[PDB]
Symmetry: D2
Subunit: 336 residues, 4 copies
C-alpha cells in the first residue's frame, strides 16, 4: 500500500548470515540477495507486502552455507544473477535457465530499483557487490551497497582456500573508497561468523572505525589480513562445491527414531545435561548459536548421522543442517 | 506400569488410529496408521515406548495408509490381513510384513491381540481382540473393529459383490455376539465418515442395545437395510483402494510456494462467505474446514498437479491434509483476490 | 446427531475432565473443569456447541477447580454435590449453582445425567450416570466416576478411624454400583500418575469387576485394611486445594513473568536433574518440569509467598501456567540458569 | 563486537523500537518500548544481556508506551524528556524516573548516548546520539530520531485538543522543527538515522520501509533538508495534512498520565450482543455474510489504522471471529492501550 521501496534483512543466527529482500513499489517486482535454501521467510514477507519474487542475486560462491539461488530459479521461475567474473575452473556450473552471468559495471533492474554490479575480488576471485539506487523514488545518488563478504561491520573478508586474494582485496578496498560516504553497507555476514552485531553500517563510519580502510601500506595490509587466521572448519570445502555445482532442491524430510545406532551421533543437549549423563561414542554439539560453527569440524557429507534429543529439538537441528546443505540425518534417539 | 492406550483422531478423515504400549517391555503398536507418523512417535517418546509394530484392519478406501511407511522408516513389523483371494489382497509389501489369519495371535510385548476375520465391509477385514496379559488379565478388554463395527452403526460393503459382502457382514455380526458384553469397541472411523458416533469408544453390550445391526435377525432384511440408500462413493475412494493395495511413495512433506502458472485445477480454501464476497475466475471453493476432504474428493484428479488459493500458512495446512489422502502433487499457490 | 463426548487430560495433574454436548440443542457441559477453559471452548466452537453447564464430582484436593470460572465467565449453570455436612460443604457459591443429591437428574439439552452419591473418597463425592436420551437410548452409556472408581483401582479416603469411616462408605458405594449394567463405560477423574491408575482413559463396569481388586474383595474388614493401609503422605498443597475448591479463589488470568528484580527464598530450577547436577545457582530447589512437576513442587510451594523460577523464558511460561492449574498465581519473575 | 543493536518493528503500529546492549558489561536499553516486553526480554536473554535501561523519545500519539512497565516490572532506570513546560510533560511517573535534557549523557555500560532536544513533532521531543565508546569509537554512529526525522520525511506537529487550542500552534511547532533540522545538519553525514516510525501508516505515506537511513542520504533525498526558506518550510510542513484517526488523542493522554500495567487476558464467548462489535474477517467474508450493526475491521496490516477511527476507549467491545484470531486482535489492541475486549462471537 505504501509506495516507498521495500527493503528487509533476514538474519540466520546459526549461520551468522544476512540475506535481503528488496521490492519495487511501482511494479511489485522483488529480489532476494544471497538466499538460503528455505525460501519461506522471503515468500511470506513478499506476500504481506503485495510483492512477487521475480529475481535473486548472489554476491559470491559461499563457503559457509548452501545457497538457495538455484532453488529460486527452479521453484519460482525467477531470473537469477551470479558473478561471471571467474576463470573457467572455479566459476558457476550446471546453472539453470534464467541465469544471468554479471560483470563489473553491469546494471540490474528490479522494477525501477537499479543495482550496479561492482566486481570486488579478495574474499573470492568472483566476488561482486551490488550498489543500489532507488530510481523509482527519483533518487539520483546511491543508497547502499550489498557487500557480501567483501566488507563487514568493523572488518573485511579473508581470502578463502592467500597473498593473491589479499592483494585483490587491497585494490577492491581502494576503489570502494570512491563511493559516497553516506551510503549504507549491507553485509553478507555478521557477529558469530571480529564482525558487528549491528546489521548495517555506512561507508563513512567504516572509514573511521574499520582497520582495513585506514591501512595504506600494502605489505602491512596483506600481513594483517592473512596473519593468524584460523584454519577453516572442514565443511567449507563441501559448501564451495555444492554452491559451485548445485545440489538437490531443498525439501523438508522426516526424522524418526533411529533404526541403526552404528552411526556418527551428535547430542544436541546443553553441556550441563550431557555432562550429567550421556551415551558413549556420542559427540555433544549443543543446539545453541554455536551449533554450525562446532558441527562443521565433525560433519562428513558422505555419511548419515543420528541425533540425540527430543523430537522437536531434533527437527530444529535437522532444519539448520539443511541450511549448510546436509540432508542426510538418518534418525534420532532420546537421551537416557 | 499399566498398559498404554491412546486414540488419535483426524477430523478431516473422521478416522481413528491407536497406539498401544507394553508396560513391561516398552514395545508398542500403531493400529491403522496414517502416513504422517509424527503424532504416534511423539506420544511413544513421552511414554518411554518404542514403536516396534503396526497393524491394519483392512485395505482402506478413505485415506492413505501409513503401514508401509512404518515398516520402511521404523523397521517395525507390520501386520495385515492375509484373508483375501489372489487378486484383491495386499501386494508389493515391504520387508517385515506379516500376513495374518483368523485366530492368529500377535504379541506387542506382553499384550495379546487375537486376530478375528470379520469380513463384510471388505472381504479381508480383520478386527483385533486385545487382552492385557501383562497385567494378568484372563479376559479381553476390547476390540479394534476397524470399519466392521462403529459406534451406533456398521460398515458398508463395496460394489453382486455388494450382496455377498452384505451376507458376510451379517455372519460376522453373528460371530462377534459371543464375546463379552463388557469389552470396549474401538472403531476405525467416527462422526463425519451411515452415521457414526462422536464418542470415540463404545462397548459390545451397549451396541447390542442401540446398534440396529445387532437387532436385525433376518438376513434378507439385514441385507436390504445395509445396502439400500447407500450414497455414491466420492471419486477418491478408488484411488485410495489402489494405493493401499499396491503402495505409493513414502510420505515426505514438501514445499508449496507461489505458483508459476495458473494453468491448473485450482481450489480456493477460504470460507464460502469470503468466496462469495470475491474470487478469481476458474477456481473451485473448497473451504478448509472439517468437510475439506469430503468435498475435495469429488474434484481431485490424482493424475494432475493442482494449485491452491490462500495465504502461505492456510496453504501449508491444506497441503498436509491432502497428503493424508495420498495426494503429494500441489504445484503452488496464489493469494486470494 | 446426537451426542458429543470428549475427554481432556492434563499430564501434570494426571486429571481427566470431559465435555459432553447435545447436538439437538447445542448445549454442552464440562465435567471437572480446570481453571483455564480455553481447550473446552475451542472444542465446543469446532463442534457448534455452547457451554451452558459445568459439573464437578467432588471437592478436589489435587488441582484448582474452574467451576466458579465457568459460572462467572460463561454465565453457565453449575452443579455440585449437596451431600455434605454443615462445615465441609461448598461455601460462597455463585447464584447459578445447583446443589444435587442422590437420584437427582441433570439434563444437558436432551442428555440425561443421573447423580449417584458415591461417598468414600470424600463424603460428598458424586458420580454422573449418562443416558443418551436424545438418541432414544433407554439404557445408560457410562458413569463419570471422579475419584470413586479408577481404571484398575479406586480412590482413597481423602485425608481430611476417620479414614475408616470413608473406607466403610467406599465399601458400600462399590456394593451399590454393582447393580448397574456391566456394559456401561467408566469415565474416571484421574489416571496414571496421581497409586495404581491405568493409562487407558476409560474402562467398563464389567471389565473392572474382572480386574479391579475393589470389586472382588467382599470381606469388609479386609477391604478397609487394604484401602487405608500403606498410603503415602499427601503433598502439602492438597490442603490448599481443598480450601480454594470449597471457598473459591480469584478468577484465572494469565500473567507476565519477566526477569526477576530480586531473589526469593523459594526459587525453583525447572531444568533436568542432570542439568542441575552439571551446574546450578545456590539457594534454589530443583523441580524438573516433567510429568512429576506438580507432585514434587507441591511439597515446597508456599501459597502465601511469591516465588522465583529458573529456566529460559519459554520453559518459565509453561511452568507458570501449570502452577496456575493448582491455584498458584504469584510467580514474581525468573532468572536464567548459571 | 562491543555492541549489540536490534530493531523491533510492529507492522500494525508501523512502529520501530530498539534494543542496544553493551557486550562488556551486559547492560542493555530499550528505546521506545511497547507495552509487551517479551520480545526485548527474549532477545536480551539470547545475547546474555540484562535490560537495565529504557528511554523514550517523546509522548507518543500512536501506540501505548511500555516505559512505565519497564520501570515497574524490570526495576530498570528509565529516561524520558524533561524538555517540557510545566503542563504538557509526563505525569504519574515511577519513582526515580530520569527527566533528561539537552546535552545530558546516558551510559548503557560503555555505550554513550547524548540527549539532543529536537522539538517540532512535539515540544518535548528528544533524540539520542549513540557513540560506541566500548569499541574505542571517537565519532557517533547513529541517531535514534523518534518522530523527528523519518526515512524520506520528518514529523509534523501533533495537533492539540479543541478545548486547549492556541492560534499559532501548528506554526510555532513548525518553527521549532525548522530549527531542529538546522541544528542536526552539523552532525557527520555518515551517521545512521534510526527512526521511531516507518511505512504502513496513512499518517506517514512518505515513510521508508527500509528500517534505517543516513544523514547524508537524507540530505540528498529528504525535502526537509533542502528547504532553507523558513516560511516555505512551515507551509509545506503544516498544509493539507490529513486528520489523524481518533485514537491519537487518547494515546497522548494514556502516555502522558500512564495506564494499568500490561497483562494478557482471557477473551471467551460472550452472549451480550449489546456492545460495540468489530468483525475481524476479510472484507470479502464480511460482504458474503455478516450481522447488521457490526463494523468490519479486517485483522490485516491496516487493522490499527482503521480501528482507530471507531475504537471507543470508554466502552467494552466484542469481537467477531474464531478464538485464535480474536486473541491476536485482542493483543494488538493492547498495543494501543485498550484492555477491555469483553468477549467474542463466532461469525454466522
Ligand atoms: Cl561523500
Ligand atoms: Fe563467503
Ligand atoms: Fe474402510
Ligand atoms: Fe480427588
Ligand atoms: Fe509521535
Ligand atoms: Mg568521496
Ligand atoms: Mg541418506
Ligand atoms: Mg465467479
Ligand atoms: Mg442465567
Ligand atoms: Mg549447591
Amino acid at each position: 500500500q505504501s509506495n516507498a521501496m521495500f527493503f528487509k534483512q533476514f538474519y540466520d543466527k546459526h549461520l551468522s548470515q544476512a540475506s535481503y529482500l528488496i521490492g519495487c513499489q511501482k511494479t511489485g517486482e522483488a529480489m532476494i540477495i544471497d538466499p538460503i535454501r528455505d525460501l519461506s521467510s522471503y515468500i511470506r514477507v513478499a506476500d504481506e507486502e503485495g510483492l512477487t519474487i521475480t529475481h535473486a542475486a548472489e554476491t559470491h560462491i559461499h563457503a559457509d552455507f548452501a545457497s538457495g539461488i538455484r532453488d529460486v530459479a527452479i521453484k519460482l521461475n525467477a531470473n537469477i544473477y551470479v558473478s561471471g567474473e571467474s576463470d573457467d575452473t572455479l566459476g558457476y556450473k550446471n546453472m539453470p535457465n534464467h541465469t544471468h552471468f554479471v560483470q563489473h559495471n553491469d546494471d540490474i533492474y528490479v522494477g525501477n530499483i537499479k543495482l550496479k554490479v561492482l566486481h570486488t575480488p579478495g574474499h573470492t576471485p568472483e566476488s561482486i557487490s551490488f550498489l543500489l539506487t532507488d530510481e523509482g523514488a527519483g533518487a539520483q545518488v546511491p543508497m547502499g551497497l550489498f557487500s557480501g563478504d567483501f566488507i563487514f561491520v568493523g572488518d573485511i573478508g579473508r581470502p578463502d582456500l592467500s597473498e593473491i586474494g589479499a592483494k585483490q582485496m587491497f585494490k577492491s578496498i581502494e576503489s570502494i573508497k570512491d563511493l559516497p560516504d553516506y551510503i549504507q553497507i549491507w553485509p553478507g555476514h555478521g557477529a558469530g561468523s571480529s564482525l558487528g552485531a549491528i546489521p548495517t553500517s555506512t561507508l563513512g563510519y567504516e572509514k573511521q572505525t574499520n582497520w582495513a580502510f585506514s591501512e595504506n601500506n600494502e605489505a602491512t595490509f596483506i600481513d594483517k589480513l592473512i596473519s593468524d587466521q584460523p584454519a577453516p572448519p572442514h565443511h567449507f570445502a563441501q559448501m564451495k562445491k555444492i554452491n559451485q555445482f548445485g545440489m538437490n532442491l531443498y525439501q523438508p524430510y522426516t526424522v524418526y527414531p533411529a533404526t541403526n545406532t552404528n552411526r556418527l551421533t551428535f547430542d544436541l543437549r546443553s553441556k550441563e545435561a550431557y555432562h550429567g549423563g550421556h551415551i558413549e561414542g556420542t559427540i555433544n554439539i549443543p543446539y545453541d548459536k554455536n551449533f554450525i560453527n562446532q558441527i562443521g569440524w565433525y560433519l562428513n557429507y558422505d555419511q548419515e548421522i543420528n541425533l540425540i534429543g527430543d523430537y522437536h529439538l531434533v527437527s530444529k537441528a535437522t532444519h539448520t543442517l539443511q541450511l549448510i546443505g546436509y540432508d542426510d540425518i538418518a534418525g534420532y534417539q532420546l537421551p537416557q
